Nucleic acid binder design. Structure first.
Ligand SMILES: Nc1ncnc2c1ncn2[C@@H]1O[C@H](COP(=O)(O)OP(=O)(O)OP(=O)(O)O)[C@@H](O)[C@H]1O
Ligand SMILES: Nc1ncnc2c1ncn2[C@@H]1O[C@H](COP(=O)(O)OP(=O)(O)OP(=O)(O)O)[C@@H](O)[C@H]1O
Ligand SMILES: Nc1ncnc2c1ncn2[C@@H]1O[C@H](COP(=O)(O)OP(=O)(O)OP(=O)(O)O)[C@@H](O)[C@H]1O
Ligand SMILES: [Mg+2]
Ligand SMILES: [Mg+2]
Ligand SMILES: [Mg+2]
Lengths: 257, 151, 257, 257, 257
DNA sequence: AAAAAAAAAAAAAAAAA
DNA sequence: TTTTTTTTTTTTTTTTT
C-alpha cells in the first residue's frame, strides 16, 4: 500500500545538514587536535544530541588491521544518577569489550586498558547533568592521565551542577553555545525541510508568508518543533487522501501546541 | 550390560576380558573392579584370572551380563597344562595382526609362534622392561618406554 | 463401592489435548529436524511438564532389531544443585544402561558411547535452573560434539541464570513463550474439561456464565488451578451423595484459595 | 527422496573462507616460526574455534619414514575443571599413543617423550579458562623446556583468569583480537553464503536491502547467527515445497530470536 | 638457505653478561663460603632463572680424583605440588645416580649418601613457591644436618608461602632482591644486545632516541620483553628481505603487546 | 585392593550510612 | 544501594597401608 509505505517513512527520523551542525563539527575538530576539554551548552530541542551523532559518523572507526579497531571518538549517554561502575561499563561496551564480574577497582583498570590501544582521541558525554557528583573525579582522572578530550555536552541546568565543584569548573571553562533559529536562517531551513525531508507528490510551498507566519508562531525557532509540526501534518494530510499539506492542516496541528 | 566381543576359540581368558573392556569403554583393571562390585561374591580377582569359585562366577556372568552369551568357561584353564607362573610371553605379530592373545602363550613347550615361526618375546628390546600383555594391553606398547614392541 | 471407584479415578491425572500442547509439539519437531538449540520458558502451573511428557509419548523408541533400542528423544529432570556426575548418571539410566563405579571423566566417555548408537536426536532438560553453573560446560560439549538439540525447558527465573554466562546465552537464544489461558480459549477448555476429565452421572454445565465467572476468578487462566478447583469439587460433591457439582461447592472450594 | 537428501545436507556443517580466518591463519604462522607463546581472544559465536580447526588441516601430518608421524601442530579442548592428569592424557591420545595406568609423575614424562620425536612446533589449547589454575604450571613447563609455542585461545572471561597469576600473565602478553562483522564485509559474506553454503534450486537474492536489513537486525554481526538464521530458513522453506527462501520465512525465523 | 640459517639461529637462546648477573654470582659466592641459607626474590621476566644457570656453568663439576664426580652446586626446579618423594628423586638424578624402587624412608637415606662424598656445597631450588608445605621439613633437615646452603629462588608470591611457617621464615631471612632495568642501564643493554645477540648484516642503530622510546614503552624495563620484541622483529624483518630492523617493524610488533 | 579426612576456596546475608 | 567478612557445609582429591 503506497499510503502505508509513506507513513512508515514519515514516522522515521533523518539528519539534515545545517549551519549550526557544521559549526559544531569544525569547533570539536579544533579541540580534538589540541586535546582541549570543553562544554557544549544550549536549550532543549535545538538539535544538540543529533549534531553529536553526526560527528561520530564523520570519523568512523578503522578496521584495516587484524588488531583491535582504533576508535577516534567515543560517544556515551549516562543513565539517571549514574555512579562510577556504570560510567566505566558503558565506555567499555562501546568499544565491543564485554565486562566481567568484579568491583570498580577491577574494571577501572580494564577501562584504562581498553582506552589504551583504541585511539579514543575524544570522549563525548551527553546528558552530563545525569552523573553523581562523585563520578566527576573519574572523568577528571581520564582527562588528566591520558590525552583525551571530554566534551561534556549539557543543557542550561548543567552549569548549575558544574559550579558546585571548583576543580571541575576550572577544567571545563571553554564553551560553545548552540542557540536556536531566527530570521532568514529559519525561512531557508523550511525551504530545505520541504525539499529534503518531505517528498509529497505535490509541493506545499511552505516558504510562503501566509503559512510561514504560522510555522514561525508554532515553532518559535526550535528545530525540534519544526520537525514535529511538519512531520505530523504530512502524515495527517496523506491519511485524508491529500497530495500536499493544506494551510488548514498546519493550523489544526498548531492549535494542539 | 556388556556388549559381546567377536569370539575366537583360541583366545586367552585374559585377552577376552581385556577386549570386553576396550569395546565397552573402560580399563581392564576397571572392568575387574566393576565386575566384582556387580557380583558381590567377594572372591573375585582383579588380576588372577583363573580361580575355581570364579568358574561359578564366570558361568553366572556369561549367563546374565551380556547381550548375547559368550563362551567364557571354554577360555578358562582349570588346573591348565604346563602353566607359566612367571610373566606371560607374547607374539608381536599376533597382537598387531589380530588384536588377541593366544591361550598357547600361557604354556611351556610353546616357545616359538606356530604361525609366524619366530621366538615368543618376554621383554621389550633395549628397554629391557618385561612385557606382559595381560597387564600392559593387546596394543603391544611398552609401559615404561612407550615404544611399540618389536620382534 | 461405586463411590470409592470414582474417587480413586478422580484423584488420578490424565493428559487433555490443548492448542498450547500441539503448538509446542510442532515447534519442537522443527528444532529436532534442524538440530537447533532452543529455549522453552513460561509461568508456573501452565501445561508444560505434561506437554513435554506428551511429546516423548508421541515419538516412542523403536526396537525392531537385536541392537540397542533406537531412542530418538531423551527427557530428564535434574535434582537440586545437580553436579556433572549426576547429569551423566541420569542420562545413562534413562537409556536403560547400568552405571558402574568410577569418576566423572571415565563416565564422560560411557555417556557419549550410549548417546551414540541410539539416535538420541533431542535432549529435553526440564527445570534447567536447578543445575550447578559448572555443568553447563558438559551440556554445551554434548550439543557441540554430537548432532543433538537441547531444549532447556524452564520458568522465568532460568533467564536470570542463563544471562550469567556469555557462551550459554548465545547458544540458546531462540525461545518459545509458553503462556496462560484467557477469553474464549478458557471457556472452550472448561467445556472440554467437563466433557473428558469429568464423567459425573449428571452434567454440571460448567460453561454457564454464573459459574464460569467463579472458575475464572478462582483460576486466573492457570490450567493447574482449573484442574485443582474442578477435581477437588468433583470428589467433595460425590462424597456428599451428589451426582453433579453444585454452585455452592465451587464457591466453597474457591474460598480456600 | 530429493527433499530429505537436501535436509540431511543443510543440517550439516562446512568451513567458508573469510578475511578473519586468513588473517588468523597467517598470524599463527609467524608465532610458529618464532616459537612465540601468544593468546588469542574473541567474543562468542564469532567463529574462533572453526578458524583453529581450518589451521590444523592447512598443516597436516607428514610421514617420510617408518618413524612416528611428524605431527606439526597439536589442537586440544580441555574438559571442565581439567586437572594435570587430564591435560597430559588428551595431548598423548591426540598424537595416537595409548596411555597406560599410572600417576601424573609417570605419564608427565611419557608426554615429554611423545612431544619430542614428532615436531609438535605448536600447541593450541582452546577454551583455556576451563582449566584448574594449578595446571598452568605444566603448560609453562612445556612452553619453557621445549621449543613449542602455545596459543591459549579463548573468550573475554579468559583475561580475568590469566590476570590472577603474574607468571602466566607476563609470558602470554601478545594477543590477536578476533572480532565480529559489520558494514560491506557483512554484505559480501551474505553474498558468499548464498553463493556457496546454499545450493537452492532457485536463488533467494539475500544481498538485496529489503531482506539484508532483516539479516542484519537478526545477526548483529555474529557469523554464528547468520549461519543459524539462513540454515534453518532453508530447511523450513524446502519443507513447505519452496525452491527459495521467502522474506516471510526470514521474518518468521527472526521473530524467534 | 642463508635466510633459514639466520632464522634457525635467531629463534634460539643465549646468555648475555649483565651487571645484575655478576652481582648475583658474587653474592652467591659469599653465601657458599659461609654456608649460609638465603633467598633470591624478584619480578617475572627479570632474568632470575638464567642468572642461576650461568652460575652452575661458572663452577662446573670437577672429576680429578678416584671418588665420585664432585659437583659444588646443585640446581633443581620442582614440578607442581612437589611432594617429598619427588624432591629426593630429582636431586639424586641430577648427581647422575639411578633411583631404585622403594619408599621415601628408603631413598631419603640414599639422597644423604650421594649428597655426601660429592662436595655439594650449595643447593639452588628454583620456583620454591610451587612445593608442598610438608616438604620444607626435608629441606630444613638437609640444610641443618649437612654443611649445605640452600638458595630458594622465587617470585614475590614465595614470601606469602614462606611467612606461613615460623621455622622456615627465620631460617631463610637473608635475601637478594632482583631488579628490573631503567635509565642508562637500559640504553647500554640495548647497545650490547644489538652487538652481541644480533648478527644482522646491516646495523639497526637501536640506541637512537626515536626507536629507543619505542623499545622503552614496549619493554617497561623487563629483559624478557626486550628479548622478545627484538628477536621477533629480527626474524620478521629478514623474512621481508630486509638487512636491518625498520622503525615500522618495531612499531608493528609493539602494537601486539 | 580402597576410603577418609579434612584444607581450603566459595557463596549468600544482613547491617549500616 | 553498595562493602566486607564470615561462617559453614558440600565437595573432589590425594595419598597411604
Ligand atoms: N494438557 C493437560 N491436560 C490435563 N491436565 C493438565 C495439562 N497440563 C497441565 N495439567 C494439570 O496441571 C498439573 C501439572 O502442571 P504442569 O506440571 O504442567 O505445570 P508446570 O508448568 O510444569 O509447573 P512448573 O513449570 O512450575 O514446574 C497436573 O496435575 C495436571 O492436572
Ligand atoms: N569459518 C566458518 N564457516 C562457516 N561457519 C562458521 C565458521 N565459523 C563459525 N561458524 C558457525 O559457528 C558455529 C561454530 O561455532 P563458532 O566457531 O562460530 O564459535 P566459537 O568461535 O567456537 O566461539 P566459542 O568458542 O565461544 O563457542 C557453527 O555452527 C558454524 O555455523
Ligand atoms: N641475561 C640474559 N640472558 C638470556 N636471556 C635473558 C637474559 N635476561 C633476560 N632474558 C630473557 O628473559 C627471560 C628471563 O628469564 P626467566 O623468565 O627464567 O627469569 P624469571 O623471571 O626469574 O623466571 P621465573 O618466572 O621462573 O621467575 C628469559 O626467558 C630470557 O629469554
Ligand atoms: Mg513442571
Ligand atoms: Mg568453539
Ligand atoms: Mg624461571
Amino acid at each position: 500500500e503506497w499510503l502505508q509505505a509513506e507513513i512508515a517513512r514519515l514516522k522515521g527520523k533523518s539528519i539534515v545538514p545545517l549551519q549550526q551542525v557544521k559549526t559544531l563539527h569544525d569547533w570539536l575538530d579544533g579541540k580534538r587536535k589540541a586535546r582541549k576539554s570543553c562544554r557544549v551548552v544550549g536549550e532543549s530541542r535545538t538539535g544538540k544530541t543529533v549534531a553529536c551523532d553526526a560527528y561520530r559518523y564523520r570519523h568512523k572507526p578503522q578496521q584495516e588491521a587484524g588488531r583491535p579497531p582504533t576508535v577516534p571518538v567515543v560517544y556515551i549517554r549516562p543513565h539517571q544518577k549514574c555512579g562510577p561502575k556504570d560510567l566505566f561499563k558503558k565506555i567499555t561496551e562501546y568499544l565491543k569489550y564485554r565486562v566481567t564480574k568484579g568491583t570498580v577497582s577491577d574494571f577501572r583498570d580494564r577501562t584504562i586498558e581498553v582506552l589504551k590501544g583504541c585511539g579514543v582521541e575524544m570522549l563525548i558525554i551527553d546528558e552530563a547533568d545525569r552523573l553523581k557528583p562523585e563520578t566527576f573525579a573519574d572523568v577528571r582522572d581520564i582527562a588528566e592521565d591520558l590525552g583525551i578530550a571530554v566534551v561534556l555536552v549539557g543543557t542550561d541546568r548543567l552549569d548549575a551542577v558544574i559550579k558546585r565543584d571548583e576543580q571541575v569548573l576550572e577544567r571545563f571553562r571553554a564553551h560553545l553555545r548552540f542557540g536556536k533559529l531566527s530570521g532568514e536562517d529559519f525561512k531557508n531551513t523550511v525551504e530545505m525541510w520541504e525539499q529534503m525531508v518531505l517528498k509529497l507528490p505535490v509541493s506545499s510551498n511552505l516558504k510562503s508568508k501566509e503559512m510561514l507566519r504560522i510555522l514561525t508562531s508554532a515553532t518559535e525557532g526550535y528545530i525540534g518543533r519544526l520537525d514535529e509540526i511538519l512531520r505530523e501534518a504530512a502524515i495527517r494530510s496523506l491519511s485524508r487522501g491529500l497530495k500536499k499539506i493544506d494551510k488548514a492542516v498546519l493550523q489544526e496541528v498548531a492549535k494542539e501546541y | 550390560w556388556l556388549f559381546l566381543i567377536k569370539p575366537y576359540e583360541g583366545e586367552s581368558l585374559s585377552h577376552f576380558l581385556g577386549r570386553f573392556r576396550r569395546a565397552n569403554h573402560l580399563s581392564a583393571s576397571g572392568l575387574g573392579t566393576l565386575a566384582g562390585i556387580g557380583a558381590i561374591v567377594a572372591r573375585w580377582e582383579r588380576f588372577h584370572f583363573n580361580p575355581r569359585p570364579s568358574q561359578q562366577e564366570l558361568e553366572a556372568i556369561a549367563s546374565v551380563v551380556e547381550v548375547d552369551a559368550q563362551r567364557l568357561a571354554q577360555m578358562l584353564p582349570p588346573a591348565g597344562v604346563g602353566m607359566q607362573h612367571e610373566p606371560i610371553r607374547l607374539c608381536g605379530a599376533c597382537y598387531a595382526e589380530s588384536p588377541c592373545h593366544r591361550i598357547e602363550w600361557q604354556y611351556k613347550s610353546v616357545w616359538k609362534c606356530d604361525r609366524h615361526q619366530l621366538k615368543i618375546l618376554a621383554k621389550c628390546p633395549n628397554c629391557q622392561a618385561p612385557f606382559k600383555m595381560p597387564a600392559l594391553w593387546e596394543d603391544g606398547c611398552c609401559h615404561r618406554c612407550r615404544m611399540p614392541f618389536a620382534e
